[PDB]
């Protein structure tokens, strides 16, 4: 009887003559059921692809080939199923389904007796059952002939737990694979594509309007990856071509744009709606109810993951197919199914998403509810909802519905887009880019302008041309931004690339790639803003041409940039053009040029340009550059001449003796006007530093000086004290972060600081001092004739013995305001005896750093009482210490007193229990200015980090 079944199965499926053949893409599937490795032989093959590609055709052709031959010969039997055409609630058995599929019933008894060794199933659909799964617990069925609703049998047959050692082939959707991958056991995955890329390009090319703007519209259509992805299926490509042709015909009558999917879909649907009406007028009430019911049904179907729409769903919303056919005349809501029950599925998923989006606009126009009787999957609906806020679609909707349309959700969308911009620690570029895409979908000036008004800072990654276009479009409406950062890693890495995609060129004459055009447009948009003053190149790698274009377009008369940064970019080719720009735009006064090697000619050109009277830069950095002795000679020659520089840095580069003497000779003359000088991480010997201080002895212009990470002897510090003692020195801040100064040098420093003004800041980090020299320092600064304000002792070998001296110093002093104690073994007794004199508050200190001082929970009471009544204290730090629960509660209760005026508090709040978290939340609630952050050193009231940038 097998031949009768063969004849019946070839008779029933016959719908493709030239679509099924011995294609090379089918031999791969035929050989797929073979052991790739000698150990492994696959048992389950799962096919996936885009929703619109012809996969059911593949399954049908497989069955037909088995029935005819030359496709599967060892396979003695195949069975085809279709679950989208059968209800999945009634109780049945595998025998009942097999009898429904197989006309004869006497064969299965002999079939199951010995065939399960070779028995193949072909299954279609299975993606719409992602909603019935209760996820709680389901009983596995081990044998057939069981009365049980069919979804459990699908689960059981899927586990290879019902009819084992039997091969299966499954067809599904990309987005329906979320729950299926943990069901099957060791599958083999095969991916299916639509048409090629060149064919898509030619098909889209043939359907453009060509009204003198064909290039831009074509490229906007094709480079958009989201649209081009779903243009894989032939149906969607045909729809897009039809919509473009329709726009071409009635060209002057359509004000809707043709650059996005929403415009084309609205064009088609609304033109079909207006065709039925003999004259331009308003839809009748029943037509309105039908439209509302259909849209809201689509919305619920999208929400609940259902795409079958049984007849009872049609009844529950008072809808019928005849009305839809009469009203639309378009292939919408097709009917499928061969049994008594019918199934209603849309012609695509895109249409369902579009109608789901269209629901939200029409919700509040009236009260429709009277006449009704009742994250990846939502990308299309969200994009369509964003795109439907265009004003022309709203105007047409108003004309149709004879009522003004003011959708509520517009405020919610604006609020969400604004919430991204105001972030406490900067903006995540992923959300910014996603918002830029969504706002480019809605081509409305008012909406975009109202959305982007509180950004003030932008960070972007650009690696696709469409990204350049959307950023260039949306940046024009940002009028509050002040700083930007672009990370172009690889798009412009290669200098030259000339190739054509189609067989012939798209345009007759281009002569210059599109990518260069879009880069130029983005750079000009950057250059034409008003409130932007800082430009940062981020982490990009640029060629010669990109740098040339940026330089040329930044020569404009409207750019107001003051800071230019190149600290992580390879721009070695375009330094000539940078030097040319340097003396043509006068609004910039800060140039950061770190980590870029410089030859002799580049330095000569830079020095020549820097001397030009048109130039106006006041800060310059050249750290980590590879310089020569001739470079140092040119630096000296520039330095002596008439220039406008006030800050110069030469960090992280070894300096020779000849360079040292040349620089000292140049700096010694009174005609050199410099305020600040930074020289850390360079290779200075004690002799070289001695000559440096000898040269500095006669100068009276510098105010700031840095010599960190250097080797300083006792002769050097003695010479420094000699220079800084005598009057007209005008030095305010001293930086000695890592030079090893020890023993007699601190005595000299204390003697100098005992009676000395015009000195304000002094730091002695990472230096070997005990209690003995700190005694001298505290005694010296105890005197009234010292005007230091800030002392930094982050990494000194400081112990708990001198805490009494610290307390007396605090209570007696009258001038200094800041005190840092970073990595000293303070202990608990030292801190409590320090806060004993700190609580009395005879001084006006405002900043106290107590991080990493080995504080236990025994010193909490004294700290709480000291911070309880001391209105002068403003800042504090308590990181890298441990605390028990009770001590933390006492501290928090102290935070809540009405007398305290703490403005910045340095804590990590994510390392305590729940109760401490709640108390800290209440502290934030009562006082609206307290900032509890761990990045204590990021707060810069006065310019303290001036040498680190």
């Amino acid at each position: 009887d097998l031949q009768d079944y063969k004849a019946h199965v070839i008779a029933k499926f016959d719908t493709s003559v030239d679509l099924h053949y011995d294609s090379p893409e089918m031999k791969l599937l035929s050989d797929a059921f073979k052991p790739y490795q000698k150990t492994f032989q696959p048992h389950t093959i799962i096919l996936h692809g885009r929703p619109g590609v012809g996969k059911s055709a593949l399954a049908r052709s497989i069955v037909l080939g088995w029935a005819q031959g030359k496709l599967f010969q060892k396979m003695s039997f195949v069975i085809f199923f279709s679950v989208r055409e059968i209800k999945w609630t009634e109780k049945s058995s595998l025998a009942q389904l097999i009898a429904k599929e197989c006309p004869d019933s006497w064969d299965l008894v002999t079939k199951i007796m010995s065939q399960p060794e070779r028995l193949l199933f072909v299954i279609d659909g299975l993606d719409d059952m992602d909603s019935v799964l209760q996820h709680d617990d389901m009983t596995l069925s081990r044998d057939w002939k069981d009365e049980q609703p069919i979804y459990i049998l699908m689960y059981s047959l899927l586990r290879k737990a019902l009819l084992p050692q039997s091969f299966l082939i499954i067809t599904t959707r990309n987005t329906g694979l979320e729950k299926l991958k943990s069901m099957v056991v060791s599958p083999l995955y095969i991916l299916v594509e639509g048409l090629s890329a060149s064919r898509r390009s030619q098909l889209v090319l043939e359907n453009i309007s060509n009204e003198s703007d064909r290039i831009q519209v074509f490229h906007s259509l094709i480079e958009n990856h989201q649209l081009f992805d779903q243009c894989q299926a032939p149906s969607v490509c045909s729809l897009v071509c039809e919509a473009l042709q329709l726009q071409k015909k009635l060209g002057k009558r359509c004000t809707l744009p043709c650059q996005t999917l929403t415009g084309l879909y609205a064009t088609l649907v609304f033109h079909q709606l207006t065709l039925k009406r003999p004259s331009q007028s308003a839809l009748s009430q029943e037509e309105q109810i039908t439209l509302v019911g259909l849209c809201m049904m689509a919305a619920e179907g999208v929400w609940t993951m259902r795409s079958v729409f049984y007849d009872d769903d049609l009844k529950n919303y008072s809808l019928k197919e005849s009305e839809i056919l009469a009203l639309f005349h378009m292939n919408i809501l097709l009917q499928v199914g061969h049994n008594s029950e019918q199934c209603y599925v849309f012609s695509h998923l895109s249409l369902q998403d579009f109608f789901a989006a269209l629901y939200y606009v029409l919700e509040g126009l009236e009260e429709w509810n009277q006449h009704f009787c009742f994250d990846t999957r939502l990308l299309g609906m969200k994009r369509f909802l964003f795109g439907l806020m265009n004003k022309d679609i709203l105007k047409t909707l108003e004309v149709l519905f004879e009522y003004p349309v003011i959708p509520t959700v517009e405020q919610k969308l604006q609020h969400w887009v604004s919430l991204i911009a105001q972030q406490v620690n900067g903006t995540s570029p992923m959300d910014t880019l996603d918002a830029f895409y969504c706002l480019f979908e809605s081509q409305d000036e008012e909406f975009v302008g109202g959305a982007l008004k509180r950004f003030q800072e932008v960070w972007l990654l650009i690696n696709q041309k469409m990204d350049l276009k959307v950023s260039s479009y949306c940046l024009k409406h940002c009028q509050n931004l002040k700083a930007i950062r672009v990370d172009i890693r690889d798009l412009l890495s290669v200098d030259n690339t000339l190739e054509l995609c189609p067989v012939v060129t798209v345009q007759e004459t281009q002569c210059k790639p599109l990518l260069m055009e879009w880069w130029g447009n983005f750079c000009s948009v950057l250059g034409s803003l008003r409130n932007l003053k800082e430009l940062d190149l981020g982490d990009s790698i640029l060629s010669q041409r990109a740098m040339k274009i940026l330089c040329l377009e930044l020569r404009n008369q409207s750019c107001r940039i003051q800071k230019l940064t190149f600290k992580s970019a390879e721009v070695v080719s375009g330094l000539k053009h940078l030097w040319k720009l340097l003396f043509s735009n006068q609004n910039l006064k800060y140039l950061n040029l770190g980590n870029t090697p410089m030859k002799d000619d580049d330095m000569k050109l830079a020095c020549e340009a820097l001397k030009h009277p048109k130039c106006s830069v006041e800060t310059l950095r050249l750290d980590s550059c590879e310089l020569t002795i001739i470079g140092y000679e040119m630096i000296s020659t520039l330095l002596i001449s008439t220039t406008r520089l006030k800050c110069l840095s030469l960090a992280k580069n070894r300096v020779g003796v000849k360079s040292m003497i040349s620089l000292g000779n140049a700096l010694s003359s009174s005609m050199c006007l410099l305020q600040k000088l930074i020289l850390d991480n360079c290779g200075l010997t004690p002799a070289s530093c001695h000559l440096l201080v000898s040269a500095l002895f006669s100068n009276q212009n510098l105010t700031h000086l840095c010599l960190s990470n250097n080797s300083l002897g006792t002769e050097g510090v003695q010479q420094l004290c000699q220079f800084l003692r005598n009057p007209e020195c005008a030095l305010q801040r001293l930086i000695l972060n890592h030079c090893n100064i020890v023993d007699d040098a601190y005595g000299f420093l204390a003697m100098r600081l005992a009676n000395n003004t015009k000195l304000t800041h002094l730091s002695l980090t990472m230096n070997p001092v005990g209690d003995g020299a700190m005694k001298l320092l505290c005694e010296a600064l105890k005197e009234p004739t010292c005007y230091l304000q800030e002392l930094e002792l982050v990494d000194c070998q400081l112990t708990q013995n001198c805490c009494e001296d610290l307390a007396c110093m605090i209570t007696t002093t009258k001038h200094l305001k800041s005190l840092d104690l970073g990595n000293n073994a303070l202990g608990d007794k030292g801190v409590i005896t320090l806060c004993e004199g700190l609580k009395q508050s005879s001084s006006s200190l405002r900043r106290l750093g107590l991080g990493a001082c080995k504080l236990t929970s025994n010193c909490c009471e004294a700290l709480s009482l000291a911070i309880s009544c001391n209105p002068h204290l403003n800042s504090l730090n308590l990181v890298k210490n441990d605390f028990s629960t009770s001590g933390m509660l006492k501290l928090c209760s102290a935070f809540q007193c009405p007398v305290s005026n703490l403005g910045i508090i340095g804590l990590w709040k994510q390392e305590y229990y729940a109760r401490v978290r709640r108390q800290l939340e209440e502290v934030e609630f009562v006082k609206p200015h307290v900032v509890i952050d761990g990045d204590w050193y990021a707060s810069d009231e006065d310019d303290r980090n001036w040498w680190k940038n």
């Binding site: 590609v53 012809g54 995955y189 991916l191 299916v192 090629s196 690889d490 067989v503």
Partner: protein, 89 residues
């Protein structure tokens, strides 16, 4: 209008929704890419990128598609460009 290709288990499904397409000469494409599959599969594992070569175009142009995250795509493309440039000379 149908193409079939295998997808290994370790390649996520989220990163297959943005190919990269590059065009270059067919004669060099056939010689550079090769015929066997073991070396190609090892290259795909090393760069964490999957590539397919198509020569259905009537002209001397062949279509190459690369899948992966942007860094992997850039590295894999650089490897292919360097190999092709060396082979051409």
């Amino acid at each position: 209008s149908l193409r079939l290709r295998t997808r290994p288990w370790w390649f996520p499904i989220q990163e297959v929704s943005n190919p990269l397409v590059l065009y270059m000469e067919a004669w060099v494409a056939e010689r550079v890419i090769g015929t066997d599959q073991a070396e190609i599969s090892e290259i795909e594992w090393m760069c964490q990128a999957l590539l397919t070569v198509d020569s259905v175009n009537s002209g001397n142009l062949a279509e190459i598609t690369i899948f992966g995250q942007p860094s992997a795509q850039t590295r894999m493309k650089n490897i292919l460009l360097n190999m092709a440039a060396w082979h051409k000379e």
